[PDB]
UniProtKB/Swiss-Prot annotation, chain A:
The modification Phosphotyrosine is found at Y31, Y68. The chain holds residues 22 to 103 of 103 of the full protein. The nucleosome is a histone octamer containing two molecules each of H2A, H2B, H3 and H4 assembled in one H3-H4 heterotetramer and two H2A-H2B heterodimers. The octamer wraps approximately 147 bp of DNA. The modification Phosphoserine is found at S27. This is Histone H4.
Swiss-Prot record, chain F:
The modification N6-glutaryllysine is found at K20, K43, K79, K86. Belongs to the histone H3 family. The modification N6-methyllysine is found at K1, K20, K28, K43, K86. The nucleosome is a histone octamer containing two molecules each of H2A, H2B, H3 and H4 assembled in one H3-H4 heterotetramer and two H2A-H2B heterodimers. The octamer wraps approximately 147 bp of DNA. The modification N6-succinyllysine is found at K20, K43, K86. The chain holds residues 38 to 135 of 136 of the full protein. This is Histone H3.2.
Length: 82, 97, 97, 109, 80, 98, 95, 106
DNA sequence: ATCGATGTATATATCTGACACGTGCCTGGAGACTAGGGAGTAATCCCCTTGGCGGTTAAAACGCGGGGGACAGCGCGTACGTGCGTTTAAGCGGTGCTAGAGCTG
DNA sequence: AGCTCTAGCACCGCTTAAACGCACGTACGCGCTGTCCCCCGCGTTTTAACCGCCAAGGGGATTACTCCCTAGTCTCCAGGCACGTGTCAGATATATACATCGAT
């Protein structure tokens, strides 16, 4: 059972992802906040993708099922079929 | 020894990470994080490589859009530093919180 | 002259209201809001059911399509409650004719 | 021929399974509709309207009216954040809004 | 025309009271009228497009409700 | 002396009154004339169902109210109470409407 | 099956008709395929809904012209309606 | 002789495959003759402007092969396609080099 | 004003693995025909919208004091960017290996 | 259900860029204050939104009729798609000239 890899998204990774977002200064305690946001977003999309996966009687999560899982939530994704 | 004024390296790496388009979070930590998130809904799941690339691209796109929103909300409050309350404000305005 | 018949779920939501609150009435405008709500939910759930039929190359929609679409669009708690109640109803249907 | 009994009686529901099946046919979502799919669908619709009627009855209990008003429906959607997530992009006619006040907008003594 | 100003100052004040807003700046009202005009031109464009489909020249409420349904803001109380 | 309320409490009572109320706070006739004016830019000599006008008024009022909680949270976020037009611009920018 | 429906060589034909000396990456071609499929489903679903709107069972050119007018904004809608009507007239001339 | 419908409509995009996808998509029980022609024309048009903008972006980057970064720049620079494709993100697309005026140094 | 590091634009040479291109072939599209019903047209028709009319009072508009909230200014000190040394592990290619999509029936 | 095989997982050793902790300075967040405006509060003014009512009329709706256009069936074939080939666009190597930041 994999455990405690929310620390895997490390502090300079969040730094780079915020610099792509156009930041100048990072709050020292915003890292946990962004981690929680990524948890809730990935939990929603992975729940939807797994529920797609269970309907196909499959036990592997497919990028195709992920794409429709994303575009049900209002955010379509390109580059992996449609 | 030479040391830059704090504020210019940030803009330089803004230019670097906005000009480029490569993967920006490390692959294996995102692997592990998706494995722990997916194991709650159903244990012993398998993932295509294209599947976790799709999750990673969705994560980068969502968080860059949120970082746009928290930057512009932070400078709405006359601040160049982003606060977490900027993030809850942005997520509240977007309607997802 | 002849009149086109208007299709509504008004009497049935009136019946379930009398089932859950026998003394309570309902106004006709609230009746129309309830009818529009159940029509909208029916449209989105049947759209998702026809989708999930198209997802895995199947030409028909079973109760499993409705159950999966319920688990998709309904958020967690009432999704589990609706799944359990629909499973109870379909087992009652299969135990009967 | 046997005594005419509806499919809702077989399913133990109040919504008509037959009308749901007919609107699945006329709606033309797929050309093949299963036997238990309209049963499950009428069950889900009945549960959803029963939950919102529970919350509307509770809202009438907190307000003390014996008729369900669209204000009560709108409040019933909003106070349950789960149902609010269900209807986040939905506006109710003459529904109003939740009475809420921000923290710093309150005066400080 | 001048009719955009027909959404009077007390109307925006009342909507801000319903939104729980304390102090309204004096130049909020013109921008609120402009945002209302943008929203109305979008919704009216879609509604009269649905209207000009049916070879009718009156916009029914059903046209309005599906026009609002198109952008992602579903309205109840008039039919489905 | 006659009682004159402090600035900030008749605002409280009007906020409470209009939050417990559900009546439309924009008058019927100016809004229907404005809808008729805007619809002239897309197709001339249009008629309008009355229920279409009330549906448009419902949707417009709800959108403007939701924008007012958005801009109120915007103004509160800037350590302020009064709403500036930059608060409305921020609210429409984060929502993706601009 | 092994027959994958796509638009890769068709979009390549379009690119050659626009920029004859310009190549395209396979990832860009996949994004092109997803984009054209998404626009396909959007217009087709809008047209089907607008057919169900006033109780018409078929889809003609009027459905899909009005769907282009509804879905895409102003100048895109006008030029796309012009191009679609041009192609429709070219078909009706050629039978 | 057999003549394809694309040359009849003067398009590169298909009428046959579009009509088959419309029929198998179960959008309606009947599909008119001109509807797949119109749809192929519209898809041809959208592909025409998006490939024009992608080629312009590749020329601005002095590139002759379309990169997904060029597609992202093409769709995000044009506001006419921005609200059309604001619903969707692009894989390996990146973001516009946009810095706010407040973030700029004095 | 001024100098030097430093990232950026501009020329030529070498290498590769992704894309352009060629070949092949089959399966879906084109061609042909026919039924027959959806779509279209014409004829009513009545209701629902437009428009007018009074009246009248709720409501918008208006003026205006004033106060309090916005906003500029200043001080501050600590939160955080920046840089350097060290250390962790992501990434890489390789190797294995079978569960399970994938397919056919 | 049976068979295929492939790609997903698992592991190993390696390299080294990345992460990490670290010390250090100062820029920025923030408390506090000064001002002053301008928005809020309310009586007064006035106007127009609103209601009730009546005419019109025409437009959507409804009918009945028709036909032609599209689904359906069938044969035919070539266009569209795995495969192979192959070769060059992009990467990296170098030199060469320029704008930008920071200490002076």
């Amino acid at each position: 059972v994999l455990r405690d890899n929310i620390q895997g998204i490390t502090k300079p990774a969040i730094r780079r992802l915020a610099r792509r977002g156009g930041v100048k200064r990072i709050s020292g305690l915003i890292y946990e906040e962004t981690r929680g946001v990524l948890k809730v977003f990935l939990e929603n999309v992975i729940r939807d993708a797994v529920t797609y996966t269970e309907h196909a009687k499959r036990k592997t999560v497919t990028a195709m099922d992920v794409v429709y899982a994303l575009k049900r939530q209002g955010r379509t994704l390109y580059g992996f079929g449609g | 020894p030479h040391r830059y004024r704090p504020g210019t390296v940030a803009l330089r790496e803004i230019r670097r990470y906005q000009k480029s388009t490569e993967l920006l979070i490390r692959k294996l930590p995102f692997q592990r994080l998706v494995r722990e998130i997916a194991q709650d809904f159903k244990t012993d799941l398998r993932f295509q490589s294209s599947a976790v690339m799709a999750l990673q691209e969705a994560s980068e796109a969502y968080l860059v859009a949120l970082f746009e929103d928290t930057n512009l909300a932070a400078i709405h409050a006359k601040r160049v530093t982003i606060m977490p309350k900027d993030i809850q404000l942005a997520r509240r305005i977007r309607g997802e919180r | 002259r002849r009149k086109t018949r208007k299709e509504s779920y008004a009497i049935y939501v009136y019946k379930v209201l009398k089932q859950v609150h026998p003394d309570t009435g309902i106004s006709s405008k609230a009746m129309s809001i309830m009818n529009s709500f159940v029509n909208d939910v029916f449209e989105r759930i049947a759209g998702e059911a026809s989708r999930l039929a198209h997802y895995n190359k199947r030409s028909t929609i079973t109760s499993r399509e409705i159950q999966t679409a319920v688990r998709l669009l309904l958020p967690g708690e009432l999704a589990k409650h609706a799944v359990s109640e629909g499973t109870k109803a379909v087992t009652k249907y299969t135990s009967a004719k | 021929r046997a005594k005419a009994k509806t499919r809702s009686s077989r399913a133990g529901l109040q919504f008509p399974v037959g009308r749901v099946h007919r609107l699945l046919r006329k709606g033309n979502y797929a050309e093949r509709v299963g036997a238990g799919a309209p049963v499950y669908l009428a069950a889900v619709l009945e549960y959803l309207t029963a939950e919102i009627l529970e919350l509307a009855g509770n809202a009438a209990r907190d307000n003390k009216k014996t008729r369900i008003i669209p204000r009560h429906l709108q409040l019933a959607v909003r106070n349950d954040e789960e149902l609010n997530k269900l209807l986040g992009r939905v506006t109710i006619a003459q529904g109003g809004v939740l009475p809420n006040i921000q923290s710093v907008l309150l005066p400080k003594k």
